[PDB]
Structure formats: C-alpha cells, structure tokens
Design a protein around this ligand. Structure first.
Ligand SMILES: CC(C)OC1CN(C(=O)N[C@@H]2CCCCc3cc(-c4ccnc(Nc5cnn(C)c5)n4)ccc32)C1
Length: 255
C-alpha cells in the first residue's frame, strides 16, 4: 500500500528518546534519506484505528508540518516513519540559553507554527495536543508541528486547554487556538512551564476563575495582544489561525 514502508529499507542509527508510544530512533531509508522512526510499544496504541487514519495523515503536506512518510504494519512493533528534525524538540531548544534568541527569531517560530496550524484548520484537522513539546526544529532552525492527531490513539494537557475543555470536554478548532496562544507564551518565555508555580488542579481552578497567563518579558505589547486573543473566555470570540497569521505577519513588519 502507498502508506506502507518496507521495514527492511530502514537502517537504525541512533536513539532519540522515549515518548508516549515508546522509543523513537534516528535512521536512514534506503541508505540515503534521514528519517525518524517511532517503535510503537505493544499495548500503547489503538493500532487499527491509527492505521486507517495514517492514510489521511499522509496527505497532510505542508512545509511546516513534520511529514508522515509511512508506517510499517505487517509486524509488531509497528513503526511510524516521519521526517527527521536535526535540532530536536522546540521546548528543549528554547531552554538552551546559548542561542541568545532575538525576539525576531521567536516571532518567526510562532509564524512557522501558525502556518502549519492554518493548513490543518483549512483541512478541518485538529492537532489536539499543540504545545512546544510537539514542535520540532530542523537544521535550518525552521519550526514544524509534530504528531498532530496522534493523541486519539493513546490507550492530559491541562495547561494548554480552554475552560470549555476543562469543564465540559468541548474540543474544537478553538481549543487548538487556545493551545496556540499558550505555545506563543512558551516561546516568548524561553520554555517555561505555563502556570509554573501551580499544579494542574490549581491551573484548572485559576482558568475557571477567569485568570490568565501574563506577559513574558520578551513579548512586546503587540505580541502579548496576539497570544491573549487566543484566551477569550468565549470560544467563538477567539480568532482563526488565518487571522492569527495575519496578526503575526503585521507585527513582523512593524518589528
Ligand atoms: C501527541 C502525543 C500523544 O504523541 C506523540 C508521540 N510522541 C513522541 O513520540 N514523542 C517523543 C518525545 C521524546 C523524544 C523522542 C521523540 C522524537 C521525535 C523526533 C521526530 C523527528 N525528528 C526528531 N529529531 C530529534 C533530534 N534530536 N532529538 C532528541 C530528536 N525527533 C518526535 C517525538 C518524540 C508524542
């Protein structure tokens, strides 16, 4: 099948880390092309459901999405083969103080993610776990969005969730928007934990009381207005990703 990679075409080279489905490794496809390979631990995934959705996810092609190249399903563990991102997770990247980021670079990261998300929104596809931990950085410093949709197959992101999610499990395009605002806060805070002094339970109470994250020192007033617009209490008063991208591009021009 066009979604199927022969595992004999893979050369495993390095271990990258361990996520919700087990170990992820760096390797080569057909001796030449860099890939990341998720080795899906038995019992961790709703595999048949994922395999059917992987057909849809293959056709999500945008330069700012970490591409799904295919799956290896004829065996267990199954494998998910994706684009390899040389500089790893955005969260860890932001926390490395040696980068000495310019705020123009931080805004560019937000724009990268916003473009990916505008594409997903145009396909009526929710990420469902948008956060710096699910963005990666390539060898050119481009940020791409990773593992969109995959939480559906896990057999909770309190700090990235709007009130209607925490109170009613009301998931929508506007809960991705809320999460994006939090991600913008992570970026401008160089990787701090949102609501860092609170537990998840205290964060949920804070959010239900109407309180919000406040301005990271590196965010201008115009950048803070953008992330804060993602956190309106009423979901329908939150922007779309098309509007956010316009907003971010405008600020990039104004500097
Ligand atoms: C959304 C939730 C429900 O599920 C999802 C499945 N999931 C999950 O597997 N995460 C792990 C997190 C721990 C580390 C292992 C890793 C690696 C990569 C990956 C992909 C492409 N390139 C690179 N490159 C590169 C360079 N250095 N390092 C260190 C990495 N790395 C993606 C994800 C994950 C969360």
């Amino acid at each position: 099948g066009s979604w199927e990679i022969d595992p004999k075409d893979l050369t495993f080279l390095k271990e990258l880390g361990t996520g919700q489905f087990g170990v992820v490794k760096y390797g080569k496809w057909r001796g030449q092309y860099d890939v990341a390979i998720k080795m899906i631990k038995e019992g961790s995934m709703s595999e048949d459901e994922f395999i059917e959705e992987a057909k849809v996810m293959m056709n999500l092609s945008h330069e700012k999405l970490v591409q799904l190249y295919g799956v290896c399903t004829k065996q267990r563990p199954i494998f998910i083969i994706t684009e390899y991102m040389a500089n790893g997770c955005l969260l860890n990247y932001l926390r490395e103080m040696r980068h000495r980021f310019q705020t123009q670079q931080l805004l560019e990261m937000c724009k990268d993610v916003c473009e990916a998300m505008e594409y997903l929104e145009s396909k009526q596809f929710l990420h469902r776990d948008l956060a710096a931990r699910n963005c990666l950085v390539n060898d050119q410093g481009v940020v791409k969005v990773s593992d969109f949709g995959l939480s559906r197959y896990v057999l909770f992101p309190v700090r990235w969730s709007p009130p209607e999610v925490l109170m009613y499990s009301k998931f929508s395009s506007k809960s991705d928007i809320w999460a994006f605002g939090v991600l913008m806060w992570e970026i401008y805070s160089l990787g701090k934990m949102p609501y860092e002094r609170f537990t998840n339970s205290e964060t949920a109470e804070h959010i239900a009381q109407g309180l919000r994250l406040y301005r990271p020192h590196l965010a201008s007033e115009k950048v803070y207005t953008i992330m804060y617009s993602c956190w309106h209490e009423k979901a329908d008063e939150r922007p779309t990703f098309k509007i956010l991208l316009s907003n971010i591009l405008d600020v990039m021009d104004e500097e």
